[PDB]
Amino acid sequence: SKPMEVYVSAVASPTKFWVQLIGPQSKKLASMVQEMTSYYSSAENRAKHVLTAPYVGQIVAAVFKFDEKWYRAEIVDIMPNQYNPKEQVIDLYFVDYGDSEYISPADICELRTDFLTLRFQAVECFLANVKSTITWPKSSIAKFEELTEVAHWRKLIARVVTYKERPRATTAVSAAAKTPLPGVELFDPADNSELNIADLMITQGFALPL
Amino acid sequence: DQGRGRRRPLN
């Protein structure tokens, strides 16, 4: 299949990360993040969308702690707050970026219907042709985060080259993730290396060939 | 078990 321009938008490990496709859809995502952040920053707007009795699978609006902007999220689990049995802690999957965060319901709103138009932007991937030098070492995860420059808008070229079945669910997961996992080649067109990211990891001792 | 994605944007 054909190569595509992507950002790596979240990382769990070299064999579990998320990409966003660059193009009309990424422009539209950026605009939506701006519009959602503008909209939900107002308490009057938030009151139009107050969250009541949330449920697993629900698509909501939520504040991302680390930039205080508003994002689309899927509720993947709900559990009692162990200080306030009165309250709940929510496990959120950010559908356009791929990362997960635990959050207070106070920081969640119902999603205004027209914000559901754009398809969910984060695509879960694994890096083809690699395996751990061991579970991945933290140093390997760090190296992969460094090479992809995750969350810093670095353009990479990705190509789907294989698929594998998703590993057994050990936790609560997203509705979509319960479809094979695409295995990709990643390369950085701006790094002066002919090696793609898998080959860089292997030849530098952060990974083994599969 | 290394299954939760994370992202940390600059600023």
From Swiss-Prot, chain A:
Role summary: Involved in the piwi-interacting RNA (piRNA) metabolic process, which mediates the repression of transposable elements during meiosis by forming complexes composed of piRNAs and Piwi proteins, and governs the methylation and subsequent repression of transposons which is essential for germline integrity. Likely to act by recruiting Piwi proteins such as AGO3 and piwi to the piRNA biogenesis machinery in the nuage. Required for the final steps of primary piRNA biogenesis by participating in the 3' end-trimming of piwi-bound intermediates into mature piRNAs.
Subunit structure: Interacts (via C-terminus) with AGO3 (via the N-terminal region when symmetrically methylated on arginine residues); this interaction is RNA-independent and may be required for AGO3 localization to the nuage. Interacts (via Tudor domain) with piwi (via N-terminus). Interacts with tral and me31B.
Protein family according to the UniProt entry: Belongs to the Tdrkh family.
Keywords from the named record: Cytoplasm, Nucleus
Organism expressing this protein natively: Drosophila melanogaster
UniProt domain comment: The Tudor domain is sufficient for binding to the N-terminus (1-14) of both unmethylated piwi or piwi symmetrically dimethylated at 'Arg-10'. However, it may not be sufficient for binding to symmetrically dimethylated AGO3, instead this interaction may require a larger region of the C-terminus which includes the Tudor domain (257-576).
Effect of loss of the gene: RNAi-mediated knockdown does not produce a visible phenotype. However, fertility is reduced with egg-laying decreased by 30%. AGO3 protein levels are decreased and AGO3 is delocalized from the nuage. No effect on nuage morphology and no mislocalization of piwi and aub. RNAi-mediated knockdown in germline tissues results in delocalization of AGO3 from the nuage.
Gene Ontology molecular function terms on file: RNA binding
Name by which UniProt lists this protein: Tudor and KH domain-containing protein homolog
Tissue: Ovaries (at protein level). Expressed in the ovary and testis.
Domain of life the protein comes from: Eukaryota
Record annotation: effect of changing residue 71 to A: Unable to rescue fertility and transposon activation defects in mutants. Abolishes binding to piwi
Effect of residue 102 to R: Decreased binding to piwi
Subcellular localization, as worded in the UniProt entry: Cytoplasm; Nucleus; Cytoplasm, Cytoplasmic ribonucleoprotein granule
GO BP of this protein: P granule organization; piRNA processing; primary piRNA processing; spermatogenesis; transposable element silencing
GO cellular component, one term: P granule
